[PDB]
Design a protein around this ligand. Structure first.
Ligand code: SF4
Ligand code: SF4
Ligand code: SF4
Ligand code: SF4
Ligand code: SF4
Ligand code: SF4
Ligand code: FES
Lengths: 453, 226, 149, 568, 168
């Protein structure tokens, strides 16, 4: 397509809405309720631009860029004065009831609301009345709840319910006493509830494990890493401070795990911070445990290994490729053993032979969401490969997406898609020894022994 | 040779973005002359990273328009939240700009396998032998995750799953602790009634305290009330 | 005339840095790390801890005074008025390690230059003695189960 | 129309003259917030453009600045030629009261520019420093050596891929440097330094000059500078826009708020901030107090070659206002840090009732001391021709009869509202003429302070702009929007949208200027600081030729330079 | 014997000639220290105290090292300001991070710059350090003095109210 933003011509995809098209080009439009993975609902009214009917139009009309298609020959203005004033007004309206909490808020320096308050250029408070308050809930060990900071943008419920398929987080109440959370105090039951700490643009849902040993984002030392907790390989950004691993943030990978982790990967990093970890080489001498440095340990181990007639190596599927290879080089190829059982290795080798010799394309984790029918045999995915279960949920919602696409409804207009696709879904057939967490969306569930499956 | 694709998973340690390395920490990293001041007032050396292309300082490159795939964190001026990932992608919600990191080791084969003709028989429950049905838990079946102290409050208590018919045959109710011997080790767990489990199977939480994942599909002997 | 006649210092003189207390007597620092990041020299290091009531405070707080330039940017950064620069200059030492002032060397027993400001009287977060709706310009929380329309 | 607006300066007659001379496709005009026309010139046409601008009807006579820039990391290069590096030449015409910035683009491997020392002799040290900090070779340069670094230095520190931080200290390098410096007096090579008779080393600041003497006559002298190089510009790339103000203070340390002023005015040009009138008056008042302090120190030092109580009065007044004596760090982006304390006017009134008698005493100590008149007049003098070609500004330039002061020619910070005169010399820059000009400047600064005291605006000390850093403190302490703005401004930094700004002010030693390039971030992409002491120290080998060493000492005492201002 | 060492240390502490080798703003503060409004009252060969007051650059460091080596025992060193203590605000490529990287320092002064009364306080501290230690009488065991931080802790923590910055 062709759009004209502030007198400049850009080529954008016509299937996109105006907000994501302009954000792709590098234009800054404030937004709260829109998310790339969740679609457009037009709640927060923050993404306002001025759309003109043609080139020689002067009045224009304030539209929401997330709800407006990026059609061919579309004339808009982002930096128009009326659009800027409306966006600043929306920020001010969000600020009327917002608590004075930024120093004692875990999202400070990481807050989308802070960034959009600064970006709209709103810094002068002329509201003088009382701010509405709220009582918090206990959401369990992982997610801290602070409902005062909510801007009522519906990202949490849209993610947790429409995307993640959870059932225990909704919106309750009315006019401006809208409340987001569980119907009662209790742990959030989703396996993907931890993505709320990044879906929520404020400090309502925060990482409680990060909150117990807290530091700001500018103080973190980050690195790109791979989650070590299961086999899916979601990209993570672990951040440390003062020598201890403080937080696991999601690291975007458009091929694998785009915006979302699972709760095991996000909250199961605390083994790195244990105080019983080995920190120096330790050699036993009778009942004593002498601490060595690096070179003494290497010389002593080399002497004893040189005296021994045959040294064998036992690797692990926890260790990296380089470490298993280094052990294999140390002990020899014939003396290297994968440190897993024979039946486990047989199943792993058969899975490998199927993947790289079966002639059938094995999809990436994001590519799973584009399949029209899913048969899951034996694998309780939600407890072993949880991100695949989330991707399977998206692939199941693909039927509602297809039905809405038949009626010329845009793919980002998610509310109309869910309205058209009421309960129709693509087929899902799961088999397990018992009930899975995918049974709420499965077309059929087969509870049977592994022989019967 | 099968692992030859790990060379292209990331660039080597000599990779630079216009001469400079990639930063591990943001530009506004603070406390650089007081974070170790309790140990010694003299600042130590910055840790040298010779293994990789990243640096252990902010003296590096983390621009969104930098020709790299490995991004340590998303930050752009004006965008401090996780919405800063919008600047690091070619289009928002799509691929990472200049490609996603990671390479597939193997391509799809030209020809497939043959049909596996080894069809197993129907499962038959025999007396005194209990087939272990694996129940995995997201919080508790991965070893290092179990070691994390925040998962102790989140993981369930280890319940052994029984069919209503099998528990009625044993006389066991929901909650009474039963003992079973595996590898000459009698261990006791409280019973949870599993309706969807089939008779002759016993459900066990794989990976948890004392129950190894190797036990999945193994038989069980001498399952009595404790 | 020194140290015979004490030298007059103006009230906003940028000398020795202290941490102050609120009028209630509790330390004002909520350990928000704004002073540490606003320091152009990086000579402030602290760590947030949190009591049972949910009150943020610094677990430790240290300033390397061999490195401080007494520019007062940390006091300008402080949203609680906890960190202040006093009119005091006699801070000479024998060992450079003894110029690293920990939290007990900094935390005075009073409010300092700002005698009435209490951040937790304005913050929305609930602590002991201050529930929800008890801050300044706050209404009591209205439950969603309430009978009013 | 705002003074910070992004202008193209296509209505400048110099642009039309360049179009008529070299053609419309020979150069690229860049729209900046510098307030000068920025013209990208091809590298081959650089000497032709310099010749053309030197021979205009009202010519561009002074090379104000010349420095490099690493463009490899700059992401917002819209409307700019493809450059890995660039070299900018800031040229000033005083007859037109205008200036132009010529930028030459360079590829990464072909880093060599024709030398500019044939047109402007003061380009020698600038090209040496551009080679030293960027590795840009200048073809035809006589002795292109390092001026801020030792000769055994690897890499060029202002390149973007150079580590800013201090590396690990080694006693071995210290012993090697001791062996190198302490064998210089024994194994001196009189061809590296540009010379070609005894060789002496001397050893405002501590610095070394290599002197070549015929008996006691100075036949050649080469200063060795860089002993006080603090890397302030590289720190400009490392600090945020707000947390760099102390570093601006610590350059020309006798200036203080005077040194803060051009930095904050350039940042406010980047931010689009028009400060209110009380902010302008406060910053003028503090800059004039510090100007009086610096002039008092300079006069007292020259008279030495009683006056330290008035400096204490000024320091007490600045202590009351800011909280600190000589590094106040008090100007902010969009205002000043605090309001004036209640009682400042009494202190200023007691200061202005004390200074006329002291000023009369200084005029009696400088005029009636005819020994000083005999030993100061004709001591390393120069005319307007030598002042223009060496970039001499401030008291020397005005002592050569050229009436060019920034506070009147290109007014800033509301200096238009104040009635004050510009003392102009007779046409010869003696030591005595410069000292008399400093005395008359001190009188005019006292007049400015009287006009500040009698007519003081009652209003805000910070602007009502969203990029005012930090916001007013009481609204920060009780408003959430203001708290958010304070949180993001003091932590990540204020975001200046991508532009280039320039501010030139009259410092206490001459003309000081900041040239800031923002890449749309919270830090500076490039910070260039032009200080007058650099150009004043370059002029010593052009004026002390054939004179005595005592004349060199008196001339050094009468230059009014500080070494931290030289080595910035 | 006991009184003799006391009188020797008394003579050393009551007569101290500083070689104020300053390099920057701190040196100019020490120039202002010599005036009659502060009342603070050579060559490195006969000077017994070296006051390093300013930034120790990588090029000025050999000069400082040589000028310290030219001094003679007993010799004492006072660092003035943040630059001489630690490098100060210049954690930059061209600055040695503290003068105690290459010469021993006996008394440190925080500040940027310290005021001259802080220099007089450091002179008092150095005099007490000299008077408490003891050296061989004819041809070195320095006393481990209590730090000023913990000594002054009670009267510093006991401070409650300060004058507000609004007034003068
Ligand atoms: S949610 Fe954001 S704006 Fe609200 S208190 Fe927290 S950091 Fe401040
Ligand atoms: S809790 Fe967070 S995600 Fe949910 S509506 Fe409120 S601000 Fe949006
Ligand atoms: S699905 Fe969960 S445990 Fe597995 S790699 Fe991803 S975040 Fe880690
Ligand atoms: S006064 Fe300046 S240098 Fe000292 S701790 Fe505060 S911000 Fe840092
Ligand atoms: S800015 Fe103030 S409240 Fe925040 S960490 Fe520093 S002293 Fe504590
Ligand atoms: S400590 Fe401060 S005042 Fe002293 S030399 Fe360094 S920058 Fe100058
Ligand atoms: S982002 Fe468009 S209305 Fe919310």
């Amino acid at each position: 397509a062709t759009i004209h933003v502030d007198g400049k011509e850009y080529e954008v995809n016509g299937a996109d809405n105006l907000l994501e098209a302009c954000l792709s080009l590098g234009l800054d439009i404030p937004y709260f309720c829109w998310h790339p993975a969740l679609g457009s609902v037009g709640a927060c009214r923050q993404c306002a631009v001025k759309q003109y009917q043609n080139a020689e139009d002067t009045r224009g009309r304030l539209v929401m860029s997330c709800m407006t298609p990026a059609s061919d020959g579309t004339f808009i203005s982002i930096d128009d004065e009326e659009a800027k004033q409306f966006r600043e007004s929306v920020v001010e309206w969000l600020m009327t009831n917002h608590p004075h909490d930024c120093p004692v808020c875990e999202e400070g320096g990481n807050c989308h609301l802070q960034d959009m308050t600064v970006m709209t250029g709103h810094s002068f408070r002329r509201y003088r009345f009382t701010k509405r308050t709220h009582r918090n809930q206990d959401l369990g060990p992982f997610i801290s709840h602070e409902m005062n900071r909510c801007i009522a943008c519906y990202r949490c419920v849209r993610y947790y319910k429409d995307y993640a398929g959870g059932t225990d987080l909704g919106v309750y109440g009315a006019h401006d006493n809208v409340y987001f959370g569980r119907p009662e105090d209790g742990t959030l039951e989703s396996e993907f509830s931890g993505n709320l700490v990044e879906i929520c643009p404020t400090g309502v849902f925060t990482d409680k494990t990060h909150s117990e040993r807290y530091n700001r984002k500018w103080d973190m030392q980050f690195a790109p890493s791979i989650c070590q907790q299961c086999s899916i390989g979601c990209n993570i950004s672990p951040g440390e401070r003062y020598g201890e691993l403080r937080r696991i943030e999601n690291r975007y990978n458009g091929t694998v795990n785009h915006y979302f982790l699972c709760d095991r990967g996000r909250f199961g990093y605390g083994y790195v911070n244990l105080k019983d970890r080995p920190r120096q080489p330790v050699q036993r001498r009778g009942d004593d445990f002498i601490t060595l440095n690096a070179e003494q340990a290497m010389q002593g181990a080399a002497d004893i290994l040189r005296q021994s007639k045959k040294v064998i190596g036992i690797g692990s599927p926890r260790a990296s490729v380089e470490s298993n290879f280094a052990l294999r080089e140390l002990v020899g190829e014939e003396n290297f053993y994968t440190g897993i059982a024979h039946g486990e290795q047989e199943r792993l080798q058969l899975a490998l032979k199927v993947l790289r010799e079966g002639g059938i394309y094995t999809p990436a984790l994001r590519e799973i969401e584009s399949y029209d029918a899913v048969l899951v045999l034996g694998e309780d995915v939600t407890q072993t490969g949880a991100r695949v279960a989330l991707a399977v949920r998206q692939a199941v919602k693909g039927k509602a997406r297809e039905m809405a696409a038949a009626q010329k409804v845009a793919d980002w207009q998610i509310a109309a898609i869910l309205n058209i696709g009421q309960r129709a879904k693509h087929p899902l057939f799961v088999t397990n020894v018992d009930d899975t967490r995918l049974d709420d969306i499965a077309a059929w569930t087969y509870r049977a022994p592994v022989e019967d499956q | 040779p099968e692992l030859a694709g790990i060379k292209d998973a990331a660039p080597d340690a000599t990779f630079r973005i216009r001469g400079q390395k990639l930063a591990r920490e943001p530009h506004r990293y603070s406390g650089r002359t007081a974070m170790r001041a309790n140990i010694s007032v003299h600042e130590p050396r910055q840790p040298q990273d010779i293994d990789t292309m990243f640096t252990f300082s902010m003296e590096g490159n983390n621009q969104p328009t930098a020709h790299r795939s490995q991004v340590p964190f998303a930050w752009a001026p004006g965008w401090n939240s996780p919405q800063a990932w919008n600047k690091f992608q070619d289009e928002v919600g799509g691929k990472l700009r200049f490609g996603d990191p990671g390479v597939r080791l193997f391509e799809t084969s030209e020809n497939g396998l043959d049909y596996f003709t080894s069809v197993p028989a129907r499962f038959q429950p025999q007396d005194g032998k209990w087939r272990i049905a694996p129940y995995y838990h997201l919080f508790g079946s991965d070893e290092l995750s179990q070691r994390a102290p925040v998962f102790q409050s989140r993981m369930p208590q280890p319940y052994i799953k029984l069919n209503p018919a099998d528990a009625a045959k044993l006389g066991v109710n929901a909650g009474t602790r039963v003992s079973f011997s595996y590898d000459g080790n009698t261990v006791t767990l409280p019973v949870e009634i599993a309706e969807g489990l089939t008779a002759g199977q016993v459900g066990l939480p794989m990976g948890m305290s004392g129950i190894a994942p190797v036990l999945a599909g193994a038989h069980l002997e001498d399952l009595k009330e404790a | 005339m020194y140290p015979e006649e004490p030298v007059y210092l103006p009230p906003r003189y940028r000398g020795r840095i202290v941490l102050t207390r609120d009028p209630d007597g509790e330390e004002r620092c909520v350990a928000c790390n704004l002073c540490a990041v606003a320091c152009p020299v990086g000579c402030i290091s602290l760590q947030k801890a949190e009591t049972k009531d949910g009150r943020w405070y610094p677990e430790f707080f240290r300033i390397n005074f061999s490195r401080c330039i007494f520019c007062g940017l940390c006091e300008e950064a402080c949203p609680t008025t906890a960190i202040q620069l006093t009119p005091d200059f006699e801070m000479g030492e024998y060992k450079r390690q003894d110029l690293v002032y920990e939290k007990e060397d900094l935390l005075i027993s009073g409010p300092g230059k700002y005698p009435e400001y209490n951040f937790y009287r304005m913050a929305g977060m609930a602590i002991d003695g201050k529930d929800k709706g008890e801050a300044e310009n706050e209404a009591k929380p209205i439950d969603v189960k309430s009978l009013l329309p | 129309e705002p003074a910070w607006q992004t202008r193209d300066h296509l209505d400048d007659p110099v642009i039309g003259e360049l179009r008529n001379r070299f053609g419309p496709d020979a150069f690229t005009v860049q729209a900046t917030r510098t307030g000068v026309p920025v013209v990208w010139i091809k590298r081959e046409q650089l000497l032709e453009v310099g010749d053309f601008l030197k021979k205009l009807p009202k010519p561009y006579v002074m090379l104000f600045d010349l420095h490099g820039m690493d463009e490899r990391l700059r992401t917002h290069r819209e409307g700019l030629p493809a450059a890995d590096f660039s070299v900018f030449y800031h040229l000033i015409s005083i007859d037109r009261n205008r200036d132009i910035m010529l930028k030459v683009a360079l590829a990464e491997n072909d880093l060599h520019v024709p030398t500019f020392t044939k047109l402007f002799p003061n380009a020698n040290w600038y090209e040496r420093e551009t080679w030293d900090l960027f590795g840009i070779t200048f073809d035809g340069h006589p002795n292109l050596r390092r001026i801020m670094m030792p000769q055994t230095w690897k890499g060029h520190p202002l390149r973007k891929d150079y580590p800013a931080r201090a590396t690990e200290f080694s006693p071995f390098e210290l012993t090697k440097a001791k062996q190198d410096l302490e064998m210089e007096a024994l194994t001196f090579k009189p061809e590296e330094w540009g010379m070609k008779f005894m060789f002496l080393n001397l050893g405002h600041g501590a610095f070394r000059i290599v002197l070549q003497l015929d008996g006691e006559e100075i036949v050649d002298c080469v200063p060795d500078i860089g002993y006080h190089h603090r890397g302030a510009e590289k720190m400009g790339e490392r600090q945020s826009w707000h947390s760099y103000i102390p570093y601006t203070d610590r350059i020309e340390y006798l200036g203080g708020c005077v040194n803060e002023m051009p930095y904050v005015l350039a940042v406010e040009k980047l931010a689009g901030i028009t400060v209110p009138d009380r902010v302008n008056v406060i910053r003028v008042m503090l800059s004039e107090l510090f100007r009086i302090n610096s002039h008092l120190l300079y006069i007292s030092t020259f008279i030495q070659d009683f006056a330290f109580t008035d400096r204490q009065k000024i320091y007490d007044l600045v202590e009351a206002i800011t909280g600190f004596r000589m590094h106040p760090a008090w100007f902010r982006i969009g205002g000043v840090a605090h309001d004036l304390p209640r009682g400042w006017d009494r202190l200023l009134r007691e200061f202005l009732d004390w200074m006329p008698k002291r000023l009369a005493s200084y005029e009696k100590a400088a005029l009636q001391n005819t020994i000083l008149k005999g030993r100061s007049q004709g001591v390393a003098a120069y005319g307007a021709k030598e002042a223009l070609e060496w970039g001499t500004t401030g008291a020397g330039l005005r002592a050569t009869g050229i009436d060019f002061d920034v506070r009147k020619a290109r007014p800033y910070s509301g200096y238009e509202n104040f009635d004050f005169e510009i003392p102009v010399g007779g046409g010869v820059s003696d030591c005595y003429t410069r000292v008399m000009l400093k005395v008359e400047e001190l009188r005019q600064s006292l007049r400015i302070l009287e006009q500040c005291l009698n007519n003081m605006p009652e209003g805000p000390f910070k602007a009502d702009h969203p990029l005012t850093t930090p916001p007013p403190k009481e609204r920060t302490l009780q408003h959430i929007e203001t708290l958010i703005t304070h949180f993001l401004q003091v932590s990540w930094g204020p975001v200046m949208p991508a532009n280039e700004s320039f501010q030139m002010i009259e410092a206490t030693k001459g003309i000081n200027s900041y040239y800031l390039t923002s890449d749309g971030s919270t830090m500076s992409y490039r910070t260039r600081i032009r200080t007058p002491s650099y150009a004043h120290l370059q002029q010593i080998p052009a004026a002390i030729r054939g004179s005595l060493v005592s004349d060199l000492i008196v001339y050094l005492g009468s230059i009014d330079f500080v070494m931290s201002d030289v080595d910035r | 014997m006991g009184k003799l060492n006391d009188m020797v240390n008394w003579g050393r502490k009551n007569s101290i000639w500083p070689y104020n080798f300053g390099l920057s703003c701190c040196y100019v503060e020490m120039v202002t220290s010599f005036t009659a409004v502060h009342d603070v009252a050579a060559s490195p060969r006969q000077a017994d105290l070296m006051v390093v007051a300013g930034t120790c650059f990588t090029k000025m460091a050999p000069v400082i090292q040589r000028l310290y080596d030219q001094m003679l025992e007993p010799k004492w060193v006072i660092s003035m300001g943040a630059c001489a203590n630690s490098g100060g605000m210049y954690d930059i490529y061209s600055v040695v991070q503290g003068v105690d990287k290459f010469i021993p320092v006996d008394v440190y002064i925080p500040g940027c710059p310290p005021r001259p009364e802080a220099y007089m306080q450091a002179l008092m501290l150095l005099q007490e350090s000299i008077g408490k230690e003891r050296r061989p009488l004819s041809w070195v065991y320095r006393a481990n003095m209590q730090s000023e931080r913990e000594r002054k802790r009670g009267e510093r923590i006991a401070v409650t109210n300060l004058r507000t910055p609004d007034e003068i």
